[PDB]
CSV table of C-alpha atoms and ligand atoms in Angstrom, one decimal:
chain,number,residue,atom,x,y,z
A,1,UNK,CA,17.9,17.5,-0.5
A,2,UNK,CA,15.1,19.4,-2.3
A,3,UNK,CA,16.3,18.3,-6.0
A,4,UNK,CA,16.7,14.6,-4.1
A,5,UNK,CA,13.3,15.0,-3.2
A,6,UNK,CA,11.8,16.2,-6.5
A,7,UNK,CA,13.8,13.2,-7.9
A,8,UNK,CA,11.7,11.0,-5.0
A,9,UNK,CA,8.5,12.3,-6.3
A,10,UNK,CA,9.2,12.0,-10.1
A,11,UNK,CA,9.5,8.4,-10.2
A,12,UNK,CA,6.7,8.3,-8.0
A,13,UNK,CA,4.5,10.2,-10.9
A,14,UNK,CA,6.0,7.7,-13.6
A,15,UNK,CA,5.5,4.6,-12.0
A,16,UNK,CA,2.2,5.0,-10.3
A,17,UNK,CA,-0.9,4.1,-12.9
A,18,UNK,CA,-3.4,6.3,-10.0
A,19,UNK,CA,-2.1,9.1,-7.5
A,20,UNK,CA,-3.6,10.6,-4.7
A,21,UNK,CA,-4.0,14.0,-6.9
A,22,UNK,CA,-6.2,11.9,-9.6
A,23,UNK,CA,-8.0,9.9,-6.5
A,24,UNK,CA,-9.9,13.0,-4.3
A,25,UNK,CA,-11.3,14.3,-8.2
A,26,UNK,CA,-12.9,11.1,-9.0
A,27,UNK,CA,-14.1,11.0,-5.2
A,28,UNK,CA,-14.5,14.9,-5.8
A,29,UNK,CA,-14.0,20.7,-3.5
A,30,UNK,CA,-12.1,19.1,-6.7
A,31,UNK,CA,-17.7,5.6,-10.8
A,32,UNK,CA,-20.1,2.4,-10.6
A,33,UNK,CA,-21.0,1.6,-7.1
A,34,UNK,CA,-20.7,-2.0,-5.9
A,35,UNK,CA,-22.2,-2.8,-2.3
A,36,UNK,CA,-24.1,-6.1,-3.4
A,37,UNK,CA,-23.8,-9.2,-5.2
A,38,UNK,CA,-26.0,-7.8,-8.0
A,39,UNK,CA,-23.5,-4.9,-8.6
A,40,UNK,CA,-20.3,-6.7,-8.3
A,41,UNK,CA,-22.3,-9.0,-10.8
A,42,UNK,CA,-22.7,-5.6,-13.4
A,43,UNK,CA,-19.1,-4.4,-12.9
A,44,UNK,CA,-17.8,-8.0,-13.5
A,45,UNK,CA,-19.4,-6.9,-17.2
A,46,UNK,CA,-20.0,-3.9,-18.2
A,47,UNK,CA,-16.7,-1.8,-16.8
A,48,UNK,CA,-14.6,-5.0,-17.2
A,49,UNK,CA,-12.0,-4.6,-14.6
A,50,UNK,CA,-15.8,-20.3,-5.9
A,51,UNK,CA,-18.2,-17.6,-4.2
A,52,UNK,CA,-18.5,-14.1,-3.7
A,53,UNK,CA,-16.6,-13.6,-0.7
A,54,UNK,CA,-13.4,-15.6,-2.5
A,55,UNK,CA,-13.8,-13.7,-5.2
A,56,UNK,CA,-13.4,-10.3,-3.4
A,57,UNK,CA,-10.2,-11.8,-2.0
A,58,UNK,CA,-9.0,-13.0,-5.5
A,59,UNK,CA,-9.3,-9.0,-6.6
A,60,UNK,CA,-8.2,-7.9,-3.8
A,61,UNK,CA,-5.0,-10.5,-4.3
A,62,UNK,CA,-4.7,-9.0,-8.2
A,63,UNK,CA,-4.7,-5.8,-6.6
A,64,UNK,CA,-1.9,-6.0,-4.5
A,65,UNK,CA,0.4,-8.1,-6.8
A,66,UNK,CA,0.0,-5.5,-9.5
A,67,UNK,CA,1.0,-3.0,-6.9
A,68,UNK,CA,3.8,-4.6,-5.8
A,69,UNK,CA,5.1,-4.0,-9.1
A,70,UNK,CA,4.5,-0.4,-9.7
A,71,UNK,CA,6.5,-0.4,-6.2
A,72,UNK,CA,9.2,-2.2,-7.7
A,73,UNK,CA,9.5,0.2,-10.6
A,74,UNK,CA,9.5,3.2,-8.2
A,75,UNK,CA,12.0,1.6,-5.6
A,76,UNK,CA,14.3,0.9,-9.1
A,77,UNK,CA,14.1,4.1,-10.1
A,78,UNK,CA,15.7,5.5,-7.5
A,79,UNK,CA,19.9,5.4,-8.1
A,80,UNK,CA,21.2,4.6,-4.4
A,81,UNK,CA,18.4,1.6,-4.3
A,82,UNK,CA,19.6,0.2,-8.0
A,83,UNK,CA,22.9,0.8,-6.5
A,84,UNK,CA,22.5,-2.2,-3.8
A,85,UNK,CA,22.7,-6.3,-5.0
A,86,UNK,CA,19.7,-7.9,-5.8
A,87,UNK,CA,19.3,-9.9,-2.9
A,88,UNK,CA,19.5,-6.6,-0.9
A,89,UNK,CA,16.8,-5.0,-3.3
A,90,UNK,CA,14.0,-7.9,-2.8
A,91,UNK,CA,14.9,-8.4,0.8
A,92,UNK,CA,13.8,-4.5,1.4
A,93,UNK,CA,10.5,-5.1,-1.3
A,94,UNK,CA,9.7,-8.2,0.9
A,95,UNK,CA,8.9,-6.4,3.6
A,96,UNK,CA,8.7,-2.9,3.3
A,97,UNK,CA,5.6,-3.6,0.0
A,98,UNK,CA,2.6,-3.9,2.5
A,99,UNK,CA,3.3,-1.4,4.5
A,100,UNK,CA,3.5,0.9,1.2
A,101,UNK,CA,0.8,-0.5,-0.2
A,102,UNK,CA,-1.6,0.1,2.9
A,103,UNK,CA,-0.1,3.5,3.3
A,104,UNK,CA,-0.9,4.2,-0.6
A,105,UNK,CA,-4.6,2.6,0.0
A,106,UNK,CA,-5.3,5.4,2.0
A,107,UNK,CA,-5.3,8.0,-1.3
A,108,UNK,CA,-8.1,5.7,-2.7
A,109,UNK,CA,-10.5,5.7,0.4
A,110,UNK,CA,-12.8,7.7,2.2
A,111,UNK,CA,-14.9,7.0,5.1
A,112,UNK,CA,-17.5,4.8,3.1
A,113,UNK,CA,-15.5,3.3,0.5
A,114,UNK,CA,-12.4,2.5,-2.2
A,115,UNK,CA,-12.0,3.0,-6.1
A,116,UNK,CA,-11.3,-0.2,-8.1
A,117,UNK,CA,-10.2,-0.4,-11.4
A,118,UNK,CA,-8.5,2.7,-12.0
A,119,UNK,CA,-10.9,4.8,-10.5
A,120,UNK,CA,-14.1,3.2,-12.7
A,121,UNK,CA,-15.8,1.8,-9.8
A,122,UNK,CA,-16.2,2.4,-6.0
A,123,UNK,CA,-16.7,-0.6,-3.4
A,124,UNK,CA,-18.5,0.6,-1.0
A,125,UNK,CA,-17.6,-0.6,3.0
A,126,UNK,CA,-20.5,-1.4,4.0
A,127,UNK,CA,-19.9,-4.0,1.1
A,128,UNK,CA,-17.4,-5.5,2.1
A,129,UNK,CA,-18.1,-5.7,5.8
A,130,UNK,CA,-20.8,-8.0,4.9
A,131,UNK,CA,-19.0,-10.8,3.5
A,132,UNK,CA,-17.7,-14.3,5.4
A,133,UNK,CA,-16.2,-13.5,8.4
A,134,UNK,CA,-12.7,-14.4,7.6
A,135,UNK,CA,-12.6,-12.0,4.5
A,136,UNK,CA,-14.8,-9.3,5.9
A,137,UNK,CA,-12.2,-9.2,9.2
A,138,UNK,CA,-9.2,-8.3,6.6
A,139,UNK,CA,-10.1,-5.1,4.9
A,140,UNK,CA,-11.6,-3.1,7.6
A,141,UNK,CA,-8.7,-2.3,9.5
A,142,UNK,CA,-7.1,-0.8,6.6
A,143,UNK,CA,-10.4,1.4,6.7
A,144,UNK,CA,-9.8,2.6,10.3
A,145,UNK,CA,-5.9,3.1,9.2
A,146,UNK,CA,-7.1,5.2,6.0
A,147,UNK,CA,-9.5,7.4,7.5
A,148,UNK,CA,-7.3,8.7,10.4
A,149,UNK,CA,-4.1,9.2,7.8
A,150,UNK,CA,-6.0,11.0,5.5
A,151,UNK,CA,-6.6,13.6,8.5
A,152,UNK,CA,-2.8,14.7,8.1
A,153,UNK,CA,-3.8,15.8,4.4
A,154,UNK,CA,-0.3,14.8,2.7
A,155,UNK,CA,-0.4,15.3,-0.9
A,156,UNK,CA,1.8,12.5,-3.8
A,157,UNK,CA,5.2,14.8,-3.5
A,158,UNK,CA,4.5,14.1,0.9
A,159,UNK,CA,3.8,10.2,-0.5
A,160,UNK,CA,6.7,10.1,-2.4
A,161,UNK,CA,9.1,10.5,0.2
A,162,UNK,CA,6.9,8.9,3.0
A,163,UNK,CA,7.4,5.3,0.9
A,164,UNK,CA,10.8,5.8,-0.1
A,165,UNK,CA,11.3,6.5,3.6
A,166,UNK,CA,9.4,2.7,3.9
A,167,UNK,CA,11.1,0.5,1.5
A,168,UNK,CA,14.5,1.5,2.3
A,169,UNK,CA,14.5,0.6,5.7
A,170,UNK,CA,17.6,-0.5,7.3
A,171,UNK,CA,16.0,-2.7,9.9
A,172,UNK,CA,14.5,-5.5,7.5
A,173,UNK,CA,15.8,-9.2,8.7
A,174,UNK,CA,18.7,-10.8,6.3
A,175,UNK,CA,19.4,-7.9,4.8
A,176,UNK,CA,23.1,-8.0,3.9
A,177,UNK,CA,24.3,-4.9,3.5
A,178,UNK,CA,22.9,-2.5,6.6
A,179,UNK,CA,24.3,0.4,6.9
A,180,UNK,CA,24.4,1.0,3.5
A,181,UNK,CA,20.7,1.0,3.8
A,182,UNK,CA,20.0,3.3,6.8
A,183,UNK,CA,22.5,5.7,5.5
A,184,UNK,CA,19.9,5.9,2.4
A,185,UNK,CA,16.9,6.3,4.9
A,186,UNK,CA,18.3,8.7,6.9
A,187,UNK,CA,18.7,10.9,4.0
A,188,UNK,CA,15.1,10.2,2.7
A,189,UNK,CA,13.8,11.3,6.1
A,190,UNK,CA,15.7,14.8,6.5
A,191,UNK,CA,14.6,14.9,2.8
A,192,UNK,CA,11.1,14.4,4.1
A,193,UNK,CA,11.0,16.5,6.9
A,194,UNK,CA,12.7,19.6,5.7
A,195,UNK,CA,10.3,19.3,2.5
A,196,UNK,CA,7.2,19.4,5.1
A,197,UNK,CA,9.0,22.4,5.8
A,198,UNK,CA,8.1,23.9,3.1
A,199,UNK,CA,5.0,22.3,1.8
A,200,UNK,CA,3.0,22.2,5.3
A,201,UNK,CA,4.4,25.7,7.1
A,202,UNK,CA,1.8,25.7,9.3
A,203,UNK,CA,1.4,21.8,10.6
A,204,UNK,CA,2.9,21.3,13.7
A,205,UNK,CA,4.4,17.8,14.8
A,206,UNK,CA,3.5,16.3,11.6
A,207,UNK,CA,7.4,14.8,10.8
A,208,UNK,CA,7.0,13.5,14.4
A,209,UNK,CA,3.6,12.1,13.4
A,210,UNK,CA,4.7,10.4,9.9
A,211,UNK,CA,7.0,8.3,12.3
A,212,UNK,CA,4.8,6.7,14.5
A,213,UNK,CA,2.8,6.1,11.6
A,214,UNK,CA,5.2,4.3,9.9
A,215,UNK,CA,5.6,2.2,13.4
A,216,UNK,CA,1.7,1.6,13.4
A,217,UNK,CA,2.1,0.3,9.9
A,218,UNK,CA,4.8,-2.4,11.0
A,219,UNK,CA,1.5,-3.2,13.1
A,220,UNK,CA,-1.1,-3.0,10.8
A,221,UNK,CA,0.8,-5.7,8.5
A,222,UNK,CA,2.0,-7.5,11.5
A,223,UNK,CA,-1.5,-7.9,12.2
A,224,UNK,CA,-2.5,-8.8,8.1
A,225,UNK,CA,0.1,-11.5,8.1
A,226,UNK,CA,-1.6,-13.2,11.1
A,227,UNK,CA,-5.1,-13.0,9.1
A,228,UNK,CA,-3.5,-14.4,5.9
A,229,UNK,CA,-2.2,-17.1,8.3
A,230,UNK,CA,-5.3,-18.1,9.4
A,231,UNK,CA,-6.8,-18.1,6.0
A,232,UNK,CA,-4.3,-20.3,4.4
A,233,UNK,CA,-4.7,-22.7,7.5
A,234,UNK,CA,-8.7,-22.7,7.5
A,235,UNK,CA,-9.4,-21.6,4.1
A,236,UNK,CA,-8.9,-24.8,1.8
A,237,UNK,CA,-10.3,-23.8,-1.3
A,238,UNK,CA,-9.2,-20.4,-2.2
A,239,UNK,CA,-6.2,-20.1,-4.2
A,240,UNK,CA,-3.0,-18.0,-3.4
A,241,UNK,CA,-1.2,-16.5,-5.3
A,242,UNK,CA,2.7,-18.0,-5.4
A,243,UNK,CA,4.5,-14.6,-5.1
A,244,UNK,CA,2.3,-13.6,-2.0
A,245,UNK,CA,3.2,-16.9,-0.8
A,246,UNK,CA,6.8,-15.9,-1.4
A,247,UNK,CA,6.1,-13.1,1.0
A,248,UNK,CA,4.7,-14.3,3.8
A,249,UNK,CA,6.6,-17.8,4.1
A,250,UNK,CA,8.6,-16.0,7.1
B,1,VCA,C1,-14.9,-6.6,-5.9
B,1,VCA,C2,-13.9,-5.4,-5.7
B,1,VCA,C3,-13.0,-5.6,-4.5
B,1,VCA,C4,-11.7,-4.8,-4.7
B,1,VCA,C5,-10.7,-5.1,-3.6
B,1,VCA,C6,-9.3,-4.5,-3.9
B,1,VCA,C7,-9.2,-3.2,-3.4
B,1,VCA,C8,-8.1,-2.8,-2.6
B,1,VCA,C9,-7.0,-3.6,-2.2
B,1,VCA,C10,-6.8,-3.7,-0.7
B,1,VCA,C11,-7.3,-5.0,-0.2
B,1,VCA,C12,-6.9,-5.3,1.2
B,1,VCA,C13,-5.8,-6.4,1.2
B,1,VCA,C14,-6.3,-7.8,1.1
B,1,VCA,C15,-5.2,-8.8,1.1
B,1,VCA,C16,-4.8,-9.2,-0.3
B,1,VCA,C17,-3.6,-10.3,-0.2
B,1,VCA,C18,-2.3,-9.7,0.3
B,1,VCA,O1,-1.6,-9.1,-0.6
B,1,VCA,O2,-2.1,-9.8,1.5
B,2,B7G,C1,23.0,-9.6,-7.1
B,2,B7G,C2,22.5,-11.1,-7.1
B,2,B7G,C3,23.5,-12.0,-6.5
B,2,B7G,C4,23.0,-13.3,-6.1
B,2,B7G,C5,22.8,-13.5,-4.6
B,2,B7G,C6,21.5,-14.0,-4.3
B,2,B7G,C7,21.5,-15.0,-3.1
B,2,B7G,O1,20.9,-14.4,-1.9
B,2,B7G,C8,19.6,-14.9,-1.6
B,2,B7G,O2,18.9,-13.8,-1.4
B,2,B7G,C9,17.5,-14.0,-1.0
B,2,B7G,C10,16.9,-12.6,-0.8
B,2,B7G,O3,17.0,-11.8,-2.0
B,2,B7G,C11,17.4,-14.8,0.3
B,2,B7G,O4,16.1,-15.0,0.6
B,2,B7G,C12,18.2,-16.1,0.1
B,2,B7G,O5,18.3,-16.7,1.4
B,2,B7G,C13,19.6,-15.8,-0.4
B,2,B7G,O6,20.3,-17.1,-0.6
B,3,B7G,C1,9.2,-8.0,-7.2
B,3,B7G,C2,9.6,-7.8,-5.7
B,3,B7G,C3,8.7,-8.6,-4.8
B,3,B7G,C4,9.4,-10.0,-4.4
B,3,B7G,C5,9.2,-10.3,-3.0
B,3,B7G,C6,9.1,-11.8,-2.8
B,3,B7G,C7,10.3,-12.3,-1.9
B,3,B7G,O1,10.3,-13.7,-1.9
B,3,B7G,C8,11.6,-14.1,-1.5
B,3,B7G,O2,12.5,-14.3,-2.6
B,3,B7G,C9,13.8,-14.6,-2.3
B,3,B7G,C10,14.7,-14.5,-3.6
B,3,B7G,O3,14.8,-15.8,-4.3
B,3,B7G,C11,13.8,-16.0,-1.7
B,3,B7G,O4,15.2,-16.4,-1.4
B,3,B7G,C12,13.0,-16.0,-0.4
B,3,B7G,O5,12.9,-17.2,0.2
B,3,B7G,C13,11.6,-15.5,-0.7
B,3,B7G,O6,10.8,-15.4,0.5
């Protein structure tokens, strides 16, 4: 379980360009700031990386898709998910990669902003409150979501496991092989809970409380697919890109 788990978290610090670890430094016990047009403007130059609320969106879209495949790196190296067919493997990505990424957003934020661009500059949320209203509504909730599972304190080895524990989730719809796939999650989460065990002695109810998170992030993306709905129905002009479109077509 433990030598499963170290396994979990080693792929983890392979695949992942920024960790949670690296994150609270740059925030700091252990960037550029963008909150206008004029900033954004700076960054877009000097630390490298149609209207401004779009092209928040358009990063925020580059963002995710580049996350989606550090995701997919992790997710392949683990052996029992390489072990399942293809179709299996991008049925179980397809759903379960925005509820990792949102839980993995979390690392990067605090209470008045996010690091972009590997840690180089912080957006700050005030920022991006202030834009049009349908791009302003997306990214706050996350906010909310962050700041309250930050409280728990998990650290990358907790992450690793928590978003194994996502991915490989037995419930996903089409997914061909079943219990193939909870019998994989089921070991991930007595993996996860006797390693919080060790890791967190004194945190009481905190396996209990990594569950219902996991439920409010079925939510949380339940509630982001509605918003990128709307967007693609209202929203004319602003491009999307065709593997997101991939995602959310059902
Ligand atoms: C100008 C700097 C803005 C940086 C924004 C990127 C930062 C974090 C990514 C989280 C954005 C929230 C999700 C937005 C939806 C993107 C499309 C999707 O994959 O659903
Ligand atoms: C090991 C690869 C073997 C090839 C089998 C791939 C065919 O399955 C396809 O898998 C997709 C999800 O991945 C579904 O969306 C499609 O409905 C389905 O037709
Ligand atoms: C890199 C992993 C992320 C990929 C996730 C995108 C999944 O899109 C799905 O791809 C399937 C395979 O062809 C299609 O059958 C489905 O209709 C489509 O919705």
């Amino acid at each position: 379980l433990k030598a499963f788990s170290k396994h979990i978290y080693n792929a983890y610090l392979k695949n992942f360009n920024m960790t949670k670890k690296k994150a609270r430094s740059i925030l700091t016990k252990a960037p550029f700031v963008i909150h206008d047009i004029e900033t954004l403007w700076q960054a877009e130059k000097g630390l490298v990386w149609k209207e401004i609320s779009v092209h928040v969106f358009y990063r925020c879209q580059c963002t995710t898709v580049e996350t989606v495949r550090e995701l997919t790196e992790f997710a392949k190296s683990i052996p029992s998910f390489s072990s399942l067919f293809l179709n299996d493997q991008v049925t179980l990505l397809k759903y379960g990669v925005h509820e990792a990424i949102f839980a993995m957003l979390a690392s990067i934020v605090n209470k008045d902003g996010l690091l972009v661009a590997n840690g180089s500059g912080f957006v700050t949320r005030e920022f991006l409150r202030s834009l049009r209203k349908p791009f302003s509504d997306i990214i706050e909730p996350k906010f909310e979501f962050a700041v309250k599972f930050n409280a728990l304190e998990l650290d990358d080895s907790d992450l690793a496991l928590f978003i194994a524990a996502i991915i490989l989730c037995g419930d996903r719809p089409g997914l061909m092989n079943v219990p193939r796939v909870e019998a994989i999650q089921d070991t991930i989460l007595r993996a996860l809970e006797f390693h919080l065990q060790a890791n967190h002695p004194d945190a009481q109810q905190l396996f209990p409380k990594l569950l219902q998170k996991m439920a409010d992030l079925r939510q949380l993306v339940t509630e982001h697919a509605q918003m990128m709905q709307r967007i693609k129905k209202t929203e004319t002009e602003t491009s999307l890109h065709p593997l997101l479109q991939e995602i959310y077509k059902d």
